[PDB]
Amino acid sequence: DNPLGLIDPTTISVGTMGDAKPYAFTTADGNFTGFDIELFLNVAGRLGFKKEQVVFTGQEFSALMPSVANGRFDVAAAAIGTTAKRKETVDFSDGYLAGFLSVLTSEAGITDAAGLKGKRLGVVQGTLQEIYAEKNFAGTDLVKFPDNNSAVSALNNGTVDAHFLDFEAAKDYSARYPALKIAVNIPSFDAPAGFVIRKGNDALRNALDKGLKEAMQDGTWKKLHEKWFPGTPMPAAYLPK
Numbered sequence: 619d620n621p622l623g624l625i626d627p628t629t630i631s632v633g634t635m636g637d638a639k640p641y642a643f644t645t646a647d648g649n650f651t652g653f654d655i656e657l658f659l660n661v662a663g664r665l666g667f668k669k670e671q672v673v674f675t676g677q678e679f680s681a682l683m684p685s686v687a688n689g690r691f692d693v694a695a696a697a698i699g700t701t702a703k704r705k706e707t708v709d710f711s712d713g714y715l716a717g718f719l720s721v722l723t724s725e726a727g728i729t730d731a732a733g734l735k736g737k738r739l740g741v742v743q744g745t746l747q748e749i750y751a752e753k754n755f756a757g758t759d760l761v762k763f764p765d766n767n768s769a770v771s772a773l774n775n776g777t778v779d780a781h782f783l784d785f786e787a788a789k790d791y792s793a794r795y796p797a798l799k800i801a802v803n804i805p806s807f808d809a810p811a812g813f814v815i816r817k818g819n820d821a822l823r824n825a826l827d828k829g830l831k832e833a834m835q836d837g838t839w840k841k842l843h844e845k846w847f848p849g850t851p852m853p854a855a856y857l858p859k
């Protein structure tokens with residue numbers, strides 16, 4: 619009666635974020651939107667779940683995987699990079715996005731990674747950016763923030779020199795706050811975004827993988843990517859055939 623092993627067989631409960639625009643964010647009415655959200659919804663329709671049967675709940679990034687592991691949500695979707703470390707806690711669907719980690723700075727700020735020595739760099743707790751910075755930015759003071767909004771506020775108030783976040787979100791903040799610019803782009807192609815599910819929920823993982831493959835094959839993935847990330851390169855792996 620519950621082949622997908624959901625908390626409630628009538629609905630899919632998804633954990634996401636309100637401040638990861640354009641991957642996942644809320645409209646002014648509060649409804650979730652963004653690339654990951656519209657992609658998940660299109661995948662869910664293929665699983666037999668209409669938009670009205672999918673509930674989105676925003677949390678701080680660090681709460682998402684533990685919330686899935688503890689059975690608070692059926693899935694998490696928020697540009698969650700697939701890593702061996704994370705696979706110890708949750709299971710992942712096939713990948714659906716591979717891009718860059720970006721250092722966002724002010725108008726007269728840092729111009730390269732070496733320029734980060736002796737600087738204050740914002741990072742969101744639990745992100746791949748925090749891991750990358752601790753491994754490759756020795757000598758940079760890392761300032762932990764619960765979300766991007768608080769970190770960008772600190773950057774704008776001059777209390778951090780830069781913020782480390784996902785490329786598309788850095789690009790969006792650079793448009794909202796025109797003085798801000800992307801100083802450094804770090805590849806993160808080895809940690810493609812995947813939907814996160816409870817370890818062992820093979821039925822749901824298999825179903826999301828099938829829907830993702832179908833969405834990529836019929837050009838839905840491409841359409842959503844062109845809508846939400848205009849100008850960003852799309853790899854053949856996620857495009858038709």
Ligand SMILES: NC(=O)CC[C@H](NC[C@@]1(O)OC[C@@H](O)[C@@H](O)[C@@H]1O)C(=O)O
Pocket residue numbers: 635638679696697698699700715716717718719742744745746747784785806807808809810811
């Ligand atoms: N919502 C967030 O804050 C996510 C931050 C960060 N995302 C990295 C990533 O998955 O973002 C989408 C793609 O660019 C991936 O290559 C990348 O590893 C992470 O997973 O930790």
